[PDB]
Structure formats: structure tokens, C-alpha cells
Amino acid sequence: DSRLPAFRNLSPAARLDHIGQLLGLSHDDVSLLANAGALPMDIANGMIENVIGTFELPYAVASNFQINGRDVLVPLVVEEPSIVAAASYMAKLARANGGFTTSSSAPLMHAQVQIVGIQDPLNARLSLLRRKDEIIELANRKDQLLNSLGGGCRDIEVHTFADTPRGPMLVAHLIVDVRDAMGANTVNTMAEAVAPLMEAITGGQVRLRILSNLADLRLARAQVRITPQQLETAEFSGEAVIEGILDAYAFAAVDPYRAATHNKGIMNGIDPLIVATGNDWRAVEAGAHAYACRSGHYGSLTTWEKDNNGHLVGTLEMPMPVGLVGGATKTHPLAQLSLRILGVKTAQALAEIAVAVGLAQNLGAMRALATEGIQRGHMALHARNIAVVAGARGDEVDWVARQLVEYHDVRADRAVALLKQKRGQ
Amino acid sequence: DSRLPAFRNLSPAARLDHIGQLLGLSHDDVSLLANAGALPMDIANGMIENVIGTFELPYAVASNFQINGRDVLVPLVVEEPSIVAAASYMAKLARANGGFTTSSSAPLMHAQVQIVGIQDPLNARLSLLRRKDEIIELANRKDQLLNSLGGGCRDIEVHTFADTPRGPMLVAHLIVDVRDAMGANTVNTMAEAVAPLMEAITGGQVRLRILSNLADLRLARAQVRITPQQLETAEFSGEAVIEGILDAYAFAAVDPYRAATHNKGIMNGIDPLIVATGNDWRAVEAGAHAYACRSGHYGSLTTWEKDNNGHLVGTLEMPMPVGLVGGATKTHPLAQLSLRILGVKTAQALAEIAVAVGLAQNLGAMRALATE
Ligand SMILES: CC(C)(COP(=O)([O-])OP(=O)([O-])OC[C@H]1O[C@@H](n2cnc3c(N)ncnc32)[C@H](O)[C@@H]1OP(=O)([O-])[O-])[C@@H](O)C(=O)NCCC(=O)NCCSC(=O)C[C@@](C)(O)CC(=O)[O-]
Numbered sequence: 001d002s003r004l005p006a007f008r009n010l011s012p013a014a015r016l017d018h019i020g021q022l023l024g025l026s027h028d029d030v031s032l033l034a035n036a037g038a039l040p041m042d043i044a045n046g047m048i049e050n051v052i053g054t055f056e057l058p059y060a061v062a063s064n065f066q067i068n069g070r071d072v073l074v075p076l077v078v079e080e081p082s083i084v085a086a087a088s089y090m091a092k093l094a095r096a097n098g099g100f101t102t103s104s105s106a107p108l109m110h111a112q113v114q115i116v117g118i119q120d121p122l123n124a125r126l127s128l129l130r131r132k133d134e135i136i137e138l139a140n141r142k143d144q145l146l147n148s149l150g151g152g153c154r155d156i157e158v159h160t161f162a163d164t165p166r167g168p169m170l171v172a173h174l175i176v177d178v179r180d181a182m183g184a185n186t187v188n189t190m191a192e193a194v195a196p197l198m199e200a201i202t203g204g205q206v207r208l209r210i211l212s213n214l215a216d217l218r219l220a221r222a223q224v225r226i227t228p229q230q231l232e233t234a235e236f237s238g239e240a241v242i243e244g245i246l247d248a249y250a251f252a253a254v255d256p257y258r259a260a261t262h263n264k265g266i267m268n269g270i271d272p273l274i275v276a277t278g279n280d281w282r283a284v285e286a287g288a289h290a291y292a293c294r295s296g297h298y299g300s301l302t303t304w305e306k307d308n309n310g311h312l313v314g315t316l317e318m319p320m321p322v323g324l325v326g327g328a329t330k331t332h333p334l335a336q337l338s339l340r341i342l343g344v345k346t347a348q349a350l351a352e353i354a355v356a357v358g359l360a361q362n363l364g365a366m367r368a369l370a371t372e373g374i375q376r377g378h379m380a381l382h383a384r385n386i387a388v389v390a391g392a393r394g395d396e397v398d399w400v401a402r403q404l405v406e407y408h409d410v411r412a413d414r415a416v417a418l419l420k421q422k423r424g425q
Numbered sequence: 426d427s428r429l430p431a432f433r434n435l436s437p438a439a440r441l442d443h444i445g446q447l448l449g450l451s452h453d454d455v456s457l458l459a460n461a462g463a464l465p466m467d468i469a470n471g472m473i474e475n476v477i478g479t480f481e482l483p484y485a486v487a488s489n490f491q492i493n494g495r496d497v498l499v500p501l502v503v504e505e506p507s508i509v510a511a512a513s514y515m516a517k518l519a520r521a522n523g524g525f526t527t528s529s530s531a532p533l534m535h536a537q538v539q540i541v542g543i544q545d546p547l548n549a550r551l552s553l554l555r556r557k558d559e560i561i562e563l564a565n566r567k568d569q570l571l572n573s574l575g576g577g578c579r580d581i582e583v584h585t586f587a588d589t590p591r592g593p594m595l596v597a598h599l600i601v602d603v604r605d606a607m608g609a610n611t612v613n614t615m616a617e618a619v620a621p622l623m624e625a626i627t628g629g630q631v632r633l634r635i636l637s638n639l640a641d642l643r644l645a646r647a648q649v650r651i652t653p654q655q656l657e658t659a660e661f662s663g664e665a666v667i668e669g670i671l672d673a674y675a676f677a678a679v680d681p682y683r684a685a686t687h688n689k690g691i692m693n694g695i696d697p698l699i700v701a702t703g704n705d706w707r708a709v710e711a712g713a714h715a716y717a718c719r720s721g722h723y724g725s726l727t728t729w730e731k732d733n734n735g736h737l738v739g740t741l742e743m744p745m746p747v748g749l750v751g752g753a754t755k756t757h758p759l760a761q762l763s764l765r766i767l768g769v770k771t772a773q774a775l776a777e778i779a780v781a782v783g784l785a786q787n788l789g790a791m792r793a794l795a796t797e
Pocket residue numbers: 004005006008081082083084085086088089092261262263264265266268361362364365366367368369374376377378474475635636
């Protein structure tokens with residue numbers, strides 16, 4: 001059961017006790033989070049190069065999430081407030097209608113084998129296509145362990161660029177079926193093995209043999225349904241909020257400026273889940289924004305419609321190059337424990353959850369922005385950080401300043417003013 | 426002096442000692458990195474909502490970096506290897522030619538005030554422009570502390586969208602001059618106060634009042650120069666490596682698949698610096714990629730050319746909405762120390778370094794990919 005009552009009122013330690021009993025975590029697992037230093041310097045020094053210490057970030061747990069009828073706790077690591085509060089509130093609403101319905105495609109990654117110096121790119125392209133099975137088998141022979149797990153190179157698609165500054169070039173794509181692995185290193189290795197053979201055929205000089213972060217073959221999808229009666233507030237009507245959201249969606253669909261902020265909100269929920277599981281967050285961001293820019297126009301990643309039934313329906317489909325047997329994933333003690341809380345068995349399981357959180361996150365920001373400003377809920381949480389920006393000396397009184405300025409007028413302009421009300425006359 | 430000989434051979438602790446003496450950090454400061462637990466739970470439970478613990482990431486320091494002739498240590502927080510190794514190697518090469526030369530624009534952020542329900546968007550647009558000074562003064566009157574610091578609302582630019590699924594809409598942009606702050610919260614607040622007046626004028630219903638992460642008015646720039654003799658290996662010649670890089674650049678400029686990877690490289694260097702400084706890494710990512718997609722085609726953020734002199738020249742211009750007086754920046758003990766190591770006095774100083782690292786990171790990746 002993901003629903004966690006009065007969880008936000010529980011102290012950090014009390015919450016960890018609750019999550020421990022629920023999940024049935026060992027006392028060894030609970031200590032990794034209770035006691036600082038879960039990451040030993042010898043391990044930390046192994047990942048990065050010039051390691052001198054370790055940097056910490058809050059590690060939270062969102063709730064109410066239901067992916068395909070199965071409840072699940074979502075661990076997040078971020079520094080910005082409201083993200084978890086929002087993500088959980090929206091997941092709570094989705095519960096009433098069956099939670100989040102997700103899916104995904106076969107984990108297909110692609111390697112790029114760039115070839116320059118060919119005077120006949122177009123003719124050379126066919127030569128590679130006829131000897132496709134020959135190149136495929138060469139790629140698989142490299143990684144035998146992958147073929148046994150059910151993965152392996154599947155097909156090859158060759159593309160050309162005749163009008164190029166540095167001249168025409170041929171770019172072959174190896175469509176590799178990795179799995180439970182982001183597959184960066186696996187695909188990159190296959191591209192190296194094939195390079196020689198492709199030069200033998202096209203007669204050009206292979207340059208780059210790297211993968212592509214724009215994983216448009218490895219998609220993850222998520223769906224939500226929101227009844228107007230659920231969004232119904234005191235000042236606004238249920239159907240009124242739906243239209244507001246729809247106006248906000250259209251806006252993000254036509255204006256790239258709003259789309260960048262709209263897509264940023266989606267990553268506010270996805271990125272923290274990636275950092276927790278020890279996955280590459282930059283790879284995820286790169287595949288996301290580039291995908292939003294596929295139709296020659298930067299736009300929304302999520303869609304918001306109003307079905308003929310009158311309910312708000314949203315979706316999120318985007319590349320999700322995540323893993324389970326990755327590098328820092330098996331290495332970092334907490335990245336390992338995060339997958340244990342999630343209960344994921346495959347990488348695609350992780351991707352389906354990642355898009356669900358993103359979708360939930362976007363709906364939350366939009367609902368807020370369409371109801372009445374964003375400063376009402378975000379600043380209430382951010383009332384602590386901003387208290388530090390004003391409190392010069394004697395940061396003890398910051399706690400009290402936060403409770404006073406929380407009267408719907410929270411801002412540094414007022415935070416500096418409330419200081420005199422206590423320090424003097 | 427940023428050059429740190431045999432630093433990679435030193436023990437993490439030995440390194441912390443060497444950075445402590447160099448910078449002249451107190452034993453209080455050094456202890457933040459030596460002993461785990463720099464971030465107390467009571468502080469950690471203050472930032473996020475359902476906090477139950479704290480996640481740790483390696484905290485490194487890159488060397489050789491020279492921004493405008495001033496040396497500087499760059500703190501980075503990431504989990505992927507080679508990033509620091511590459512960033513530092515390339516910076517080492519840049520030194521020979523003067524290091525990295527940077528610049529930036531006035532820190533300008535913009536808020537969007539979307540207005541629906543106007544039967545005459547185009548006409549309403551002029552009414553807001555004529556009463557521009559009147560809406561401006563209203564936004565400033567809100568944040569008094571910003572005006573004293575030299576900030577505040579500067580101008581307003583109204584845009585229209587007649588062909589929209591949900592109908593025509595008017596969108597006003599408040600060009601605010603924040604400073605030393607990412608300005609997300611400052612801008613969004615000015616947009617709330619102004620909303621009432623804009624409805625009074627246009628006669629429409631204001632919907633969203635949020636900022637825009639695509640900060641194309643708050644740009645940061647970096648330049649590098651690399652002599653062929655420097656890239657000259659044993660197997661490859663100097664000039665040969667130059668042509669390889671140029672071939673790689675052209676590839677990223679025309680194909681969106683290579684561009685996504687090319688740009689990811691640039692982010693491998695910038696994000697770690699942002700996480701360390703406690704800045705919003707998602708805001709930087711959104712502004713970066715959206716800016717790469719401005720010309721209706723996703724391409725390179727960085728540029729690589731071969732001047733009439735024969736040297737490889739590269740640049741990186743992009744939005745950098747970063748800060749010093751932000752939320753988690755003033756709260757996280759290590760975020761604060763990171764700025765102290767950097768020695769930056771303004772946000773624009775931080776931004777300039779940020780794009781410098783990005784540019785270095787990309788050069789490194791391309792060189793490797795181009796060599797073998
Ligand atoms: C934060 C709320 C939900 C206020 O919440 P509220 O409307 O005041 O309602 P509430 O507090 O009475 O709601 C209670 C329920 O909400 C949840 N909840 C509520 N607070 C908490 C909390 N503190 N800690 C844990 N859970 C919380 C919690 O699940 C709880 O369930 P129950 O207690 O009944 O079991 C809200 O105002 C909101 O929707 N905020 C949206 C802000 C957001 O999305 N921020 C993320 C970043 S967005 C960004 O950076 C830029 C942007 C916005 O432009 C991006 C974009 O446009 O996409």
C-alpha cells in the first residue's frame with residue numbers, strides 16, 4: 001500500500017521506520033539511509049577521477065503511485081521543493097480512476113557509424129543493405145552474453161547526407177536490443193567491431209562510432225484520467241480547471257518558451273528518480289528535449305485532452321534510456337536499495353514508472369498554474385530556504401520567521417521586514 | 426595556480442589537504458568534505474518533502490582551468506567517469522593559448538502572462554505597449570530590494586497567437602533584470618501583480634503567469650583555441666586530428682541523432698558544476714536544448730572552425746540561468762563552499778565558468794572520438 005497517511009508530519013526517522021516495516025527492509029538496509037556515509041570513499045574514488053569528498057542531496061519518497069494497479073514507492077533525489085508534494089498529490093487523484101496505465105517498447109538502442117570520403121554515398125548505401133545480415137552477425141558475435149539474455153543486434157538502417165559542409169557522408173545505424181542496460185557501452189562496442197567491415201564495403205573512412213542519446217526506439221508511455229469533480233475547488237469549478245489546463249497545454253504546444261518550462265516541469269519528477277537509481281540523468285534529458293523537437297518545432301512532451309466523456313486525459317511518451325545493471329547502479333549502495341524499494345525486475349519496468357512520475361508532475365504544476373498562481377503552494381515550502389537568504393546573523397530565528405511569513409505573503413521583500421519586528425522596534 | 430601535478434595520484438584526503446592549503450580553507454571547511462554528513466537531516470528535511478535520508482555523489486575538482494587569465498578550481502558532482510579527466514586535460518591544453526575567454530549578457534529573465542478570451546489580440550497588443558511604462562512601474566514597486574541592487578523590470582514585449590487550438594491568445598513578456606539569482610521566484614511574483622492591470626487593459630482572462638526556462642536574454646559565452654601541434658599524436662598528425670574534429674562537428678550540425686549525443690557531452694560538464702553549486706540542473710538542461718532547437722532544427726550548441734591561421738577554434742553560447750542567492754544555494758553547506766572555491770562574486774561570473782567547462786568537455790569528447 002503506497003498511501004502513506006500523515007507521512008509528511010512524521011519525522012525523517014519515523015518515516016524511515018514506516019517504510020522499513022512496510023517494505024520489510026532489513027536493519028542493514030535502514031541504516032544506509034539513517035546513518036550518513038552510505039558511500040565509502042574507496043568506492044566514491046572509483047567512480048569519478050579527482051574525488052576529494054562526497055556531495056549530499058535529500059532523499060525522499062513519493063506516494064500514492066499506482067502503476068498498472070500495483071502500488072509502488074518512488075524514491076526521489078532533488079533540492080527543489082514542492083516536487084514531491086505535487087507528484088504525490090496528483091498520484092492520489094489518479095488512484096480514484098485506476099492510477100497510471102503504462103507501457104513500453106522493446107529496449108532498442110542505436111549505434112551510429114559515420115563514414116566519410118565516399119564519392120557515391122547513395123550507391124554505397126545499397127551495398128550495406130544487401131550485406132545487412134553479414135554485418136548483423138558480426139555485431140552479435142562480439143557480445144555473446146547479450147544474445148543469451150535475449151538481446152542482440154536486430155536490424156540496420158543506413159542514412160545519407162549529400163549536402164554537408166565537410167562533404168557527403170554515410171551514417172549507418174545499428175539497432176541493438178539491449179536490456180536491463182542503458183546499453184551505451186554495449187552498442188558502442190558493436191559499432192567498433194563492424195566499422196572495419198563497413199569500410200571494406202563502402203570504401204570510405206569511418207569516423208565516429210558512438211551511440212545516439214535520441215533513443216526514439218526505446219519509448220515509455222503513461223496515461224492518466226482526471227474527473228472534473230476531483231479538481232473542483234472552492235473558488236473554481238471542476239470543469240473550469242479542466243479548461244484552464246487545456247489552455248495551458250495549447251500554450252505550451254505553440255510557444256517554445258512555455259514548452260521549455262512545461263518540459264522542465266516534467267523532468268522535475270523524472271530526473272530525481274534517475275539520480276536515485278544511479279542512472280545517467282544527462283542521457284535522459286538529451287533524449288527528451290530532442291524528441292520534443294522532432295517535428296521541426298519544440299513542443300510539449302505530454303498531451304492533454306478532454307475526452308467525449310468530459311474527463312481530463314493526459315499522456316506522456318518519450319525516450320527512456322535507463323538501466324539496472326549499469327555502472328554506478330551496481331556500485332552505489334543506495335542506487336541498489338532504490339531499485340529494491342521500486343520492486344522493478346526489468347529496465348522497462350523502471351522506465352514505465354519514470355514516465356508516470358513525469359506525467360504526474362506536469363499535471364500538478366499545470367493544475368496549480370491554472371487555478372491561481374504558482375506562488376501559493378511552491379513558496380509555502382520554499383519559505384525555509386528564502387528565510388536563510390534574509391537571516392544574516394542568528395539563523396536560529398529562521399524557523400520562526402518561516403511560520404510567520406507563511407500567511408500567504410511569503411517573499412524576501414517581506415522576510416527582511418519581519419526581522420526588525422523581532423530584533424528591535 | 427590551478428595546475429595540480431600528480432593530483433590524480435594523490436589520495437582523496439591527500440588531495441583535500443592540497444586544496445585546503447592552496448585555497449587557504451579553514452579546518453572547519455575542510456571538515457565538511459573530510460567527514461561525511463555535511464548536510465544535517467534538519468536541513469535536509471527542510472528542502473524536500475518526504476525526506477527519509479540523503480543520497481551521496483562523488484565530489485571532484487577539475488584543474489588547469491583559466492577563465493580570462495584567472496586560474497580557478499572547478500568543483501563537480503557526477504557519477505560518470507572520464508568527465509573530470511577530459512575536462513581537466515582539455516583545459517590544460519587551452520592554457521598554452523591563453524586559456525578560456527568568456528563573456529555574458531545582463532542577467533535578464535522573462536515572465537509570461539498568457540491572456541485568453543480576447544476577441545482582438547492584435548489590437549489589445551498595442552494598448553499594453555502604449556501603457557508599457559505603467560505596467561513596468563507596477564512590477565518594480567513589488568520587489569523594492571531588487572531595484573536597490575540594480576535589478577528590476579526593464580521592458581515588455583507582447584506577442585500574439587491567432588491560430589491556436591484553444592483559440593487566439595495574447596502573451597506578454599516581462600523582461601526582468603534579476604542578478605546573482607536565477608530569478609525564477611522573483612519573476613513569477615512580478616507577473617502575479619501585473620496580471621490584474623493587464624486584464625483591465627486587454628479585457629481578457631489571464632491564465633498562466635510563469636517564467637520561461639528558455640532564457641535567451643541571459644546568454645553566456647566561451648572561446649578556445651587549439652594548435653594542431655598540441656593535438657598531434659603518435660599515430661595521427663596534428664592537422665589530421667583537426668579535420669577529424671571538424672568532420673565530427675559537421676555531423677552534429679546536420680543530424681539530430683549526433684546532436685543529441687554531442688550536446689549531452691556538453692552537459693556532462695555543466696550539470697556537475699550546477700549540482701555542486703546547488704543550482705537547478707533541470708532549468709539549465711531545458712534552456713540548453715530548447716536553445717539548440719531555435720532554428721527549427723536540433724543542432725550543436727558549440728561551434729568548431731579552423732581559422733585562416735590554421736588553429737582549431739571553438740565556441741559555446743547558451744542560456745545560463747544560475748544563481749548565488751538562490752534557494753538550495755544558501756542552504757546547502759557544500760553548495761556554499763563550492764562558490765567559495767570558485768571565488769565567484771556574481772552569477773554571471775558563475776555562468777561564464779559553466780560554459781567554459783561545457784566547451785572543454787565537448788572538445789575532449791570529440792578529440793577522443795576523432796583520434797581512435
Ligand atoms: C504543493 C501543492 C500540492 C499544495 O497542496 P494544497 O493544494 O495546498 O493541498 P493539501 O496540502 O491540502 O493536499 C493534501 C494532499 O496533498 C499532498 N501534499 C500536499 N502537501 C504535501 C506536503 N507538503 N508533503 C507531502 N504531501 C503533500 C498529500 O499527498 C496530501 O494527502 P493526504 O495528506 O490527504 O494523505 C500544490 O500547490 C501544487 O500543485 N503545486 C505545484 C508546484 C509544482 O508542480 N512544482 C514542481 C516544479 S514546477 C516548476 O519548477 C516550473 C513550472 C511550474 O513552470 C513547471 C511547469 O509548468 O510544468
